[PDB]
Design a protein around this ligand. Structure first.
Ligand SMILES: [Ca+2]
Ligand SMILES: [Ca+2]
Ligand SMILES: [Ca+2]
Ligand SMILES: [Ca+2]
Ligand SMILES: [Ca+2]
Ligand SMILES: [Ca+2]
Ligand SMILES: [Ca+2]
Ligand SMILES: [Fe+3]
Ligand SMILES: [Fe+3]
Ligand SMILES: [Fe+3]
Ligand SMILES: [Fe+3]
Ligand SMILES: [Fe+3]
Ligand SMILES: [Fe+3]
Ligand SMILES: [Fe+3]
Ligand SMILES: [Fe+3]
Ligand SMILES: [Fe+3]
Ligand SMILES: [Fe+3]
Ligand SMILES: [Fe+3]
Ligand SMILES: [Fe+3]
Lengths: 164, 164, 164, 164, 164, 164
């Protein structure tokens, strides 16, 4: 039997599909950075796309552990172009903040239903969104300092290109 | 400057998006196998989904190597249900055969344009599809022989669950 | 001096004795499986009994860390017979769900008292109960596929019999 | 089929439940030592509790080895308050001597029925009881010599807290 | 941009400065223990002072991760004398309970604002205050047993002087 | 019995408290570098804050070695903002030179009282201050040559961020 409500299952399944789109959106940013010839920024975005899949699969696992089932939905076409490196990371930040609020909405839903298991499960994502948002903000602040200057941009590209 | 034609770039880009859908489809099969309590078959499908992403990234890399750009498209909602283990693997064989013909069409289009670079590049995928189809056929033959004997199905699930 | 309320200390002490009974209940299931000649299912239940003692000792330590004292209560006699292997694991699942709800009751009591320490302490058990219930549901699902087939049940017995 | 008599099976089963109570009694002494702030004495009692469970499981194995079956009974509530350190260990000695006589009674019963297998099996517990009693007598003699001296009690607590 | 409210930022910053004062308070207790010739107690306090600084730096990091800024405030002069070792640990316990309640007040503030990131971040400190209070309570209980006796106090001094 | 004069003990104690303030000042400079997004400069200041604590503890241990006692005093609130990176390090140089003169003043006071042990103890701090001032002057020189060039400032931030 399923021991999460259908409302909570739908919220979690929706979020899993949102993590899939996040992976896809960051791959799309990679296609933009590669088109612009910044392979280190593109590498960072390919690593980011893989990271989002690990998020999706943690939602996947929990849904089945609570007796639910995962339904994959259509993935919408992401944008494929941004107006410079900074613009792409600014869209990344607005996306991560939207993901954070999406996760907050599940937490308050599960809290209202006294679904302590799901509330507790979501703590890891609450903490991970803090780091996710900070990692983008950190890059945005370095890009602000870089201004338009290619010598600094190249430094960031090499540094981000080392992401493990 | 792009040294593949736009027609070949489009066909390669379509195939990249088709490998992405292939990954999504096999994840969908995993959701079905997990829902049915067959974690070993689900594990195999999750590994298959990752194998398809390596195919997509090989197309990704070739497109940029020839001066083109990748555009990610919407990904259709995959089926989420099958009438049994055999039915899902039969659908996988059909999907792989379709991928093989899709690759064939690019090969023939590249050949008519005398794009020997792309023709040569696709040889890897031609040989990989022979193996991809064979690996599903092998599993189908095992399921056929098992008939419906759960004891043998349990062993197959465990075996496929050891996929590296 | 004690820094949990007496109401919370009693709720935690009750839950400790509840975990001791759970251990005893699972050892009793071991006596049934050994009586039926399923040493692998018995082995799994003996490991489960030890696992419940580790739960009891975690409540033990926290009670003393909060300046409380533990008082052991009489342990009721458990059932010693079930109507087949599946009926015993169904009894185990229902028992775990009652354990989960008992823990939820402590969590809501502590939360009402603004005993943030005990609320936080109980998160570990909220998460463990997710896993505890899932581990039983997984065996139940495998038993349902086994139907009655001794060839399948032999496989399950040897698989569970290797639990570490 | 069972090759011990029911009278011998019941006696062995009674002793198994008696060893479970012994383990519970020693855990209760630990709750007392922990309440009094003697973690080393409490550690010794937790170790003793686990040692008693190995005794119970030896009776468990032997009962099934002779075709019998184990029935777990209710476990009585142990005392939880002693006058002081030495009184707890004196209660342990009297309990171990009661356990020894209880084993003597099974030996004489099995001997009267010419159940030489059960008589032989019990030799290990006879020899183990000599050591069990001796190990408590040694601690009692240290506590008697200590008289009330807290500095000695501290060293004894620390020594016993090292039990493997 | 700062994604904690100014009310929560100020509560976190206040607490950072309280952990700094806590470090300075324990260093002062070390100056007292060293003046009294108890180098083991002094060593424990120097280690405690470093431990408090790790708490301050965790608040520091989280404030910057949420886009806030740390402002260091004046540090008040601590007491430098106590009426014996036991009086000093009584003051330590009083101080830790005040730190615990200070953390609870932040938790309830962030909960009221639905600042789930800060609520979750604070769980680590809720759990650590449980241990912090218990470690002082333990030493106080042993000093109560010691009464005045130098033979017991020398044991505590050398044991605490092994703190890593 | 204290074998330094009270005047020398107070001068040594004043200096200990000034090394504590130095630590706190450098931590405040870290808060400023972190606010400005230069984590490598902040790291260097955090390491510098720890170094000043080792200076404080050397004064601590010598005071007790000579039979004296340490009294911790209030710590003034440090500045928390500077007019750029160079302005912060110039405040650091000025503070280090003030620390050197402060040490010179103790040396001359002890020399006047013929406290050869304290004069000799201070030689280490005389030599360390030479290095301390020079390490700041070296960074100031690199900043002067860097002028405003963000490209160079990025490299200096990363270099100083390697400080062990
Ligand atoms: Ca990340
Ligand atoms: Ca393959
Ligand atoms: Ca388990
Ligand atoms: Ca023994
Ligand atoms: Ca710890
Ligand atoms: Ca601690
Ligand atoms: Ca230095
Ligand atoms: Fe994510
Ligand atoms: Fe993300
Ligand atoms: Fe493929
Ligand atoms: Fe394929
Ligand atoms: Fe449990
Ligand atoms: Fe359980
Ligand atoms: Fe025994
Ligand atoms: Fe015994
Ligand atoms: Fe602290
Ligand atoms: Fe503390
Ligand atoms: Fe210094
Ligand atoms: Fe300095």
């Amino acid at each position: 039997m399923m021991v999460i409500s259908e409302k909570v299952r739908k919220a979690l399944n929706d979020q899993l599909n949102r993590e899939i789109y996040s992976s896809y959106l960051y791959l799309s940013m990679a296609t933009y950075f590669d088109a612009e010839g910044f392979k280190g920024f593109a590498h960072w975005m390919k690593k980011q796309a893989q990271e989002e899949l690990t998020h999706a699969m943690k939602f996947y696992e929990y849904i089945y552990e609570r007796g639910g089932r995962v339904e994959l939905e259509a993935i919408e076409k992401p944008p494929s172009n941004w107006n410079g490196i900074k613009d792409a990371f600014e869209a990344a930040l607005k996306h991560e903040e939207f993901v954070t609020q999406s996760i907050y909405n599940i937490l308050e839903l599960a809290s209202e239903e006294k679904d302590h298991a799901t509330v507790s499960f979501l703590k890891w994502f609450v903490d991970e969104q803090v780091e996710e948002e900070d990692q983008v903000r950190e890059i945005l602040d370095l890009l602000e300092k870089a201004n338009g200057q290619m010598s600094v941009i190249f430094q960031l590209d090499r540094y981000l290109g080392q992401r493990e």
